[PDB]
Amino acid sequence: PISPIETVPVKLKPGMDGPKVAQWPLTAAKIAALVAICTEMEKEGKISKIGPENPYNTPVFAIWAKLVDFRELNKRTQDFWEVKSVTVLDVGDAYFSVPLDEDFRKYTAFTIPSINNETPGIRYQYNVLPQGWKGSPAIFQSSMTKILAPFKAANPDIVIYQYMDDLYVGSDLAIGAHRTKIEELRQHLLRWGLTT
C-alpha cells in the first residue's frame, strides 16, 4: 500500500532544472514488459500519468524488472544527510510505499516507448520513492525509523538495526519467542503500509 507518513521536502540544487534525458528505444519484449509493470504500479497509486505540462524525462529500462537511470536527476538533486537469534527482513520493496514530496514528483518523469515509434508513448511520474534516486535511502531510513520508534519502545529486548534495504532483528529470545516478535514486527509494519 502507501504509508500514511508525511513526506520529506526535497529540492533541486540551486539554479538547477529537472533532467531532460532522451529515452533509448527499447526491445519490444522490454516495452511490453514495462507496460505490465507500470500498469500495476499505476493501479496501486505508485506512479501517475502526466500531461504536456511536464517537460522532464529520465530513461528507464527493463532487465522483468523496471530500472530507472536517475544519473542526471541525481546530479541535480540536493544533498541529504547520510547516516542470539537474528532475522534479516528484506524491506527493499517498501520504498514504493513511502510517499515522495508532491512538488518533487514532476522531476521523476519517464516515458515508456511506443512499439515501432508508432504511438507517442506513455508518460508517468513517481508518487513514491523511486529506486536508484539519490534521496530514497536517506528518506526511507528516516521514515522507517519513525515507524519503528513505538515498536522499539515496547520491545527494548530486541535490537532492530537497519542497513539500507535490510532490517536486522536480533534478540537472545528462544527461537520461538523471537520468531513471534518478528511476526509482531511484520504486522506493525503492515499497519503502516509496508509489507515485509
Residue partners of 94: CB distance under 8 A and separation at least 6: 140, 144, 189, 194, 195, 196
DSSP code string of 182-196: HHHHHHHHHHTT---
C-alpha distances in Å from residue 64, one per residue of 29, 73, 76, 91, 164: 10, 24, 29, 19, 23
Residue range(s) of every CATH 3.10.10.10 domain in the chain: 1-83+96-139
User: What is residue 114's three-state secondary structure?
Assistant: coil
**CA–CA gap between residue 116 and residue 101 (Å, rounded):** 35
Query: Is residue 23 a contact partner of residue 31, using CB atoms and an 8 Å limit?
Result: no
**Resolution (Å) of this entry:** 2.2
**CA–CA gap between residue 130 and residue 135 (Å, rounded):** 9
E strands, 1-107, where? 47-49, 60-62, 66-68, 85-90
Domain 1-83+96-139, classified CATH 1.10.3720.10, yes or no: no
Select 84-95+140-196's CATH number: 3.40.630.30, 3.40.30.10, 3.40.50.720, 3.30.70.270.
3.30.70.270
Residue range(s) of every CATH 3.30.70.270 domain in the chain: 84-95+140-196
Give burial (CB, 10 Å; 0-12/13-18/19+) of 194. buried
Residue partners of 190: CB distance under 8 A and separation at least 6: 196
**CA–CA gap between residue 167 and residue 89 (Å, rounded):** 5
Cell numbers found for residue 142: 528516516
Residue partners of 195: CB distance under 8 A and separation at least 6: 1, 93, 94, 97, 189
